[PDB]
Amino acid sequence: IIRRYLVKQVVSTSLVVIALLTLIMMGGRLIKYFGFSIIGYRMPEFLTLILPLGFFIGLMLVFGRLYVDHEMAVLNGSGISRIRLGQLLIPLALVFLVIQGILMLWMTPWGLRQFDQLSKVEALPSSKLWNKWNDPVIASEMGWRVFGPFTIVIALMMAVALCEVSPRQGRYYRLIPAIFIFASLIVLLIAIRTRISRDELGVWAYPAALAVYGIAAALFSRK
Amino acid sequence: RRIVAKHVTKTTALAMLGTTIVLVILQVLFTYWQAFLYVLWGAPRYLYEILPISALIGAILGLGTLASNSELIVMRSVGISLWRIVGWVIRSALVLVLLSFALSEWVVPYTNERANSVKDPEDLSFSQLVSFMNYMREYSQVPKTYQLAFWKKVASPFALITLVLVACSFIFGPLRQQSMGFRLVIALFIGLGFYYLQDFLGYASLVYNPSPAWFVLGPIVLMFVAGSYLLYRA
Amino acid sequence: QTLCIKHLAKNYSKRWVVKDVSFEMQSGQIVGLLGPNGAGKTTSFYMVVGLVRMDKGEIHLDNLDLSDLAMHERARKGIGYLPQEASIFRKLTIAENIMAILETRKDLNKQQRQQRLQELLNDFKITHIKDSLGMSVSGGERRRAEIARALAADPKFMLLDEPFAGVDPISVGDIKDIIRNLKDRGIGVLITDHNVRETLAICEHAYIVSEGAVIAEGSPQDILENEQVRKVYLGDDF
Amino acid sequence: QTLCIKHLAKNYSKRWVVKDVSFEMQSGQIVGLLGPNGAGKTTSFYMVVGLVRMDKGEIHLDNLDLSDLAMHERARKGIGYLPQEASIFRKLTIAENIMAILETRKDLNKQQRQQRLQELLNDFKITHIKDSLGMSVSGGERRRAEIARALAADPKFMLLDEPFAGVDPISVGDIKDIIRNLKDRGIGVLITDHNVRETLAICEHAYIVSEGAVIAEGSPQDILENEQVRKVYLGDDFT
């Protein structure tokens, strides 16, 4: 009952944030493009970034709401920690990992393939990129598609760590400080995709970037 | 009344200037030895484009501190109207408007020349823009991309004051009794919403027959009317 | 002066929290607006001040209709408000808080403004903290500066919101002495409070509002011996 | 069982809010942690619950240290918390509110979880409203659902924060029966409240925390006759 309570809350507020970020992230690009089929073919490209951001923000809004209106004091006071509440959402995070794995591996290339013809390694089919790991350009793109979906898991254990907020501080107090901590992971991963494409860093740095953020989030959640 | 006016003005002015210092530092870092001077010389041009959005966040945080501390309730409890408290905040914004004029007229056109040496109609200063348009009009037809640039500059002080009044009306209206984080989040959505709306309607003025004055002064008049209505609801 | 208030009404989420609340208050008299929590004592109190817009009702102050006036337009007519929460100007000194509202007065010049400020500080015994910031004073000392600040505007009716909120039994006498001082100054006091034991000890005429309507009226002695109030609000033992 | 608290301390902004607060509460006994507002009675209460991190001292429950355990680890030892503000799960059914905590219990199976929920609803006379949402109930009925939910975790000590907060005199007696019932259930109750007059009417052992330290201890009759309390907290005239 407590797992279904959280999953229903997180899914409801993540879809609101995702639809709010899609209207903002691609409303800005649509205006720049104006300066309807193009937006349709770039849905999987932007939702590749919005989905980890929507899940992270939606996780902190739910965990912020539990703290603000004292539903966390009665959950900790009943024997259910905050770490335990984050472990109840692993089945949900696995669904979002599978969902984004579909976007990153299939629809992001397919969406970029049709857009390119209408308007590159960003749009090549994943079948043609499974092999040819020797070439750093394919190595960066294929690694971006395999280790990319695992930002959902990192968005789960890092939103649990950075959600503790006082009732008087507010539900939105820890949003801007911690969205930048999450965004620093994605900005680092985009900054890693470029380094691998120039054969300067190696494909091994994708799990290393996640592990450093994974261990840092796990240590901070257990302080 | 002077002591109350100074307290409201100084608190908002420090919030508008405090947000300005932070927003410029972040934008300098985000934009970023030869490449450091090129970004450092561009600070006045980054400063000019932050003033409309730093005044919005400054009035949200400046009045939010007053509202959350129940200081705006006891100014009304003694007979100080909402439009008087807005007028005191506008005095703080009038420093940013005067700063916008100083940057536009004497600072931006100079550091832009210095920045380009280290390494558009929008980039032209108002003194250069009006003089150039008057020169073209005397011998040829002025393009619609210069009329839009002219209207986007003459309506820059009026977009700073209107966006401040909207911020003040939100504190007294929808954003009353809300958290400081929620006010900051909403202040960021209005800032992006205004930048996108003025960008889109700027492009739409170059593709449609009506003059760019309608598209540039459109949102400013509507936000002023809508913002002044939220103040009438108290 | 009489503050006639007739047929107040207000709805929230299509539910009428206040239904026909009407009471009369006179200058130089303490009137307690009491009742069960959430039954409309707070909402009816805020509609007198002006925070909550009046859906229906008439508020008169010596045949002068204040119904349509806003919060500030009523405050200029002589209605004061003392918030329950800390409402002192944090970055202004205690003497500057009182002087801030004294400059609002039109019938005072600079010469008598300083004289009025001096006696207001002496009346509430906050002279020793007149130079300390409002954010660095005791809760008991700060509350005396908020009442002194409200009196700088020369109100005719001071509407106190939760005066005995978080007040220890040792300092409940200090608040009663303050409220009694406001009455002796010719200012009517309207008190809404959850602490009904002490609010029924200073007020001369109390109004108990339950289910959104005034269910009883009269002196505190008559309020106690009221069957409907005893059954609904005060209980059999009190 | 005897909850032992020794030498609590906590400094906020380089100011020692709590200085050497120590009290003992036994199971089945109601203890009122009172004192002047802002004198450290609220902060000392929170260090017992676990909201604010301790800065000096120790907490024992039958030679079983709880100082290093977090808030959730003490709850499994038998320590409950009831926030003063509305802490019900707003969008959960009242029957599900008690059930959400009953599923936490390891010593109950499905067969006896529904039985425990059914008797918990009947013990608090909320079985008629057991099908309504948490946010769509009366203030008096909501608090009865928060105490039934707290008992679902089966605590040995309940730390009530401001139980008589925003409570009409008609419904003060209803809470008195609830707290008396908690004592009759073998569960010790620790109460911190600003309403000292009504808190002293049910507690058999009250602690007065002034200037950050415990200055009084014993039955409410001994507290009233104490000249140190009547000088700082209760005043000359108080009953």
Numbering used by the authors:
A (entry chain F): 2 to 36, 49 to 132, 247 to 350
B (entry chain G): 4 to 35, 49 to 135, 241 to 355
C (entry chain B): 10 to 247
D (entry chain A): 10 to 248
Authors' own words:
The impenetrable nature of the outer membrane is due to the presence of a large, amphipathic glycolipid called lipopolysaccharide (LPS) in its outer leaflet. Assembly of the outer membrane requires transport of LPS across a protein bridge that spans from the cytoplasmic membrane to the cell surface. Here, using structural, biochemical and genetic approaches, we show that these antibiotics trap a substrate-bound conformation of the LPS transporter that stalls this machine. The inhibitors accomplish this by recognizing a composite binding site made up of both the Lpt transporter and its LPS substrate.
LptC also contains a TM helix that exists in two states. In one, the TM helix is sandwiched between the TM helices of LptG (helix 1) and LptF (helices 5 and 6), which form the gate through which LPS enters the transporter lumen. In a second state, the LptC helix has moved away from the transporter. Movement of the LptC helix between these states is thought to be important in coordinating LPS transport with the catalytic cycle of ATP binding and hydrolysis. We obtained a structure of A. baylyi LptB2FGC in the presence of LPS, although density for the LPS molecule was poorly resolved. Despite several attempts, we were unable to obtain an LptB2FGC complex in which 1 was also bound. These data are compatible with a model in which binding of 1 and binding of the TM helix of LptC at the LptFG gate are mutually exclusive. Superimposing the LptB2FG–LPS–1 structure with the LptB2FGC–LPS structure identified shifts in the conformation of LptFG, particularly in helices 4, 5 and 6 of LptF. This conformation of LptF creates a pocket between helices 4 and 5 that better accommodates acyl chain 6 of LPS.
